Design a protein around this ligand. Structure first.
Ligand SMILES: CCCCCCCCCCCCO[C@@H]1O[C@H](CO)[C@@H](O[C@H]2O[C@H](CO)[C@@H](O)[C@H](O)[C@H]2O)[C@H](O)[C@H]1O
Ligand SMILES: CCCCCCCCCCCCO[C@@H]1O[C@H](CO)[C@@H](O[C@H]2O[C@H](CO)[C@@H](O)[C@H](O)[C@H]2O)[C@H](O)[C@H]1O
Ligand SMILES: CCCCCCCCCCCCO[C@@H]1O[C@H](CO)[C@@H](O[C@H]2O[C@H](CO)[C@@H](O)[C@H](O)[C@H]2O)[C@H](O)[C@H]1O
Ligand SMILES: CCCCCCCCCCCCO[C@@H]1O[C@H](CO)[C@@H](O[C@H]2O[C@H](CO)[C@@H](O)[C@H](O)[C@H]2O)[C@H](O)[C@H]1O
Ligand SMILES: CCCCCCCCCCC(=O)O
Ligand SMILES: CCCCCCCCCCC(=O)O
Lengths: 324, 324
């Protein structure tokens, strides 16, 4: 009787679509199979977990890898439902919130609020809820495909999000919004398309955005660390956590490192909910090709590198922050 | 602008489903990724094409393999739409029919009609159309999953198909229906679960059903060879072709071989429309593990085997039909 290798509701919904729908979807899936994109993604997830969580045993690593594949794909289907739904419904999708106090307090302080959202869990579900208490200005990068871009921006417009370009005009508009006491959402854990700073990530110096830290340290806005995880029964639990006050100290690179620590701790606790498909660890000049070589050699290069970042740090010369 | 890496209608339909739908579908897809079923299927398609069409060049073989992956997946989504639709709509899905004359003539003869349908193209689309001219009795094997079985049988009941078990009681009911001048549909190109006859298939002796030939040679029913191919624009072209009269001669094994020839010719003409995922070539005691070993060694074993089936055939002893 081995089970739920389909549901009848599923089959009936697919069955009621036009033939064109099925043909287009099959062409999409087949394109994914024929170009090996699915295998490539699975292997990048596996390598990333080997890099960041080297203490897992082979068995634990298999369970986590399989669950992370499942969970990230699930998150993206969930995003489809979220971006097809009204604000009311998306708000009612939040069943439990932890740390709401810090959000309302940060809004009371009227110094601005920077919501720091890693690519983790079902993060797109939080926006509707946040939006009922504050205006939000958000960096937006148009999706490469026009129809998808279209869809996403109906979603964001329904949320009343103020979308701004991912360039210095968008950054200026975010500074302005924070000055007025409003809110922005930054996902800080991808590699910037242009620039910037070599900041350690799981012990590996990686080129990293400084945006969060620059906004926070200049405006003295409050920084909150946010994430949402699906519940056993169709709901989500949202978590709001204040950023360590160290984030205000030092250079933007120092604050960036504090954000990195928060991300690391979240992953350590919930490794199966991080979105591991992204090829983050390529962002070092020694690591440009680690997703394209033999996984074991890749790991040896990474280990060499983490080994040098320690002594060059006790050493007074800035080896690891030098960009060439 | 590279394109139709999604459509907006697609995204909006997925977006309007409940969150449960997305979670269940992602769990399904992820299960497929995590158990390597997708890679395994792709490799079985590739091996089957190497076995049956050894004259293809590597480039031609890649184009055909990719198109066959696309086309079989497309066929199954099309089956979903067909089995969710009314008879009227499914009939209007047939835009062009070739050889309709032979079908109406076979019904006029009132000796019964056996429709021989390879697993090819979009074969499930033909049933509704056939059903408006004749009653149909069909072998049915319950789908392993209960919900899917459910769905499929609403589809067949709406078609007024008389489903019968895949055992000798079903065979007796099909004989009875043919005696009355009615029609049956047999898909003859899979390996039987129990028995039977070593019949050459692309030069390889494979255990094969004899059902079609036994029905046809006893009842003298007319045998028609049927297949449907999707058109450029959302329709399908159906093809009805009389079976070579040799099918009436000799043993059931001889008639089975005539069906095999018809299938071979259809594949030679339309290799991209055959459903190549099925592991048909395992059905020989020398070939039990060819989908699980190195593809080149597999092909060497197959070539050895086709090499012996020739001389043992000119030789008077029945080497290849001996079942042990
Ligand atoms: C219909 C097929 C089934 C549906 C599921 C398809 C999964 C598609 C995921 C492909 C890989 C991720 O694809 C990537 O997703 C992110 C969101 O994370 C998009 O990001 C886009 O939306 C987010 C949030 O509104 C913005 O912050 C971002 O600026 C914008 O570019 C990227 O533009 C897209 O390239
Ligand atoms: C100029 C920096 C030099 C260092 C680069 C070295 C190698 C890079 C390692 C990982 C880089 C992956 O390269 C690319 O980065 C961009 C921009 O962040 C990603 O884009 C992604 O991040 C941005 C920022 O949150 C999101 O708006 C978007 O949803 C997402 O898809 C691309 O999906 C990825 O293909
Ligand atoms: C919701 C996910 C997306 C939908 C697409 C899913 C593709 C599923 C295909 C899996 C592999 C094929 O799965 C197989 O299909 C054939 C039809 O060809 C089914 O066959 C079933 O229906 C046919 C026609 O009504 C009958 O002749 C047969 O007796 C019956 O068992 C098998 O019971 C099933 O095991
Ligand atoms: C007892 C015969 C001894 C020879 C067997 C030697 C190895 C077999 C090689 C290929 C066998 C594959 O083994 C199995 O055959 C059965 C029955 O036909 C298939 O079942 C399939 O064929 C039947 C007959 O049309 C369809 O009703 C059904 O839709 C389809 O899924 C299974 O999908 C396949 O898993
Ligand atoms: C610790 C692993 C590196 C961080 C980057 C993960 C972000 C996932 C976003 C999904 C995607 O766009 O591919
Ligand atoms: C010439 C290749 C062998 C014939 C069997 C193909 C039938 C495909 C049915 C699809 C499936 O059930 O896996």
């Amino acid at each position: 009787p081995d089970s739920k290798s389909m549901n009848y509701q599923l089959l009936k919904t697919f069955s009621r679509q036009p033939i064109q729908f099925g043909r287009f979807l099959a062409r999409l899936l087949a394109g994914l199979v024929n170009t090996l994109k699915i295998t490539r993604t699975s292997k990048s997830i596996e390598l990333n977990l080997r890099i960041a969580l080297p203490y897992l045993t082979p068995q634990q690593r298999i369970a986590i890898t399989e669950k992370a594949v499942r969970n990230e794909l699930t998150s993206y289907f969930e995003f489809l439902s979220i971006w097809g739904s009204s604000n009311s419904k998306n708000i009612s999708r939040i069943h439990r919130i932890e740390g709401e106090h810090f959000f309302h307090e940060a809004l009371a302080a009227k110094k601005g609020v920077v919501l720091i959202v890693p690519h983790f869990g079902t993060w797109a579900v939080m926006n509707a809820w946040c939006a009922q208490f504050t205006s939000m200005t958000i960096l937006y990068k148009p999706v490469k495909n026009a129809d998808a871009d279209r869809f996403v921006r109906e979603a964001r417009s329904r949320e009343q999000a103020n979308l701004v370009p991912t360039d210095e005009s968008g950054v200026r508009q975010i500074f302005k919004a924070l000055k007025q006491g409003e809110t922005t959402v930054i996902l800080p854990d991808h590699t910037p398309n242009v620039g910037g700073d070599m900041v350690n990530y799981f012990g590996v110096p990686l080129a990293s955005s400084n945006l969060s830290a620059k906004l926070i340290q200049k405006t003295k806005a409050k920084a909150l660390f946010l994430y949402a995880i699906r519940n056993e029964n169709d709901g989500f639990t949202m978590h709001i956590e204040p950023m360590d006050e160290k984030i205000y100290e030092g250079t933007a690179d120092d604050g960036t490192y504090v954000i990195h620590q928060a991300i690391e701790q979240l992953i350590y606790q919930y490794p199966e909910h991080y979105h591991w498909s992204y090829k983050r660890f390529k962002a070092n000049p020694a690591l440009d090709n680690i997703y394209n070589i033999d996984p074991t050699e890749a790991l040896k290069i990474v280990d060499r590198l983490k080994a040098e970042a320690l002594k060059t740090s006790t050493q007074p010369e800035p080896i690891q922050t030098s960009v060439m």
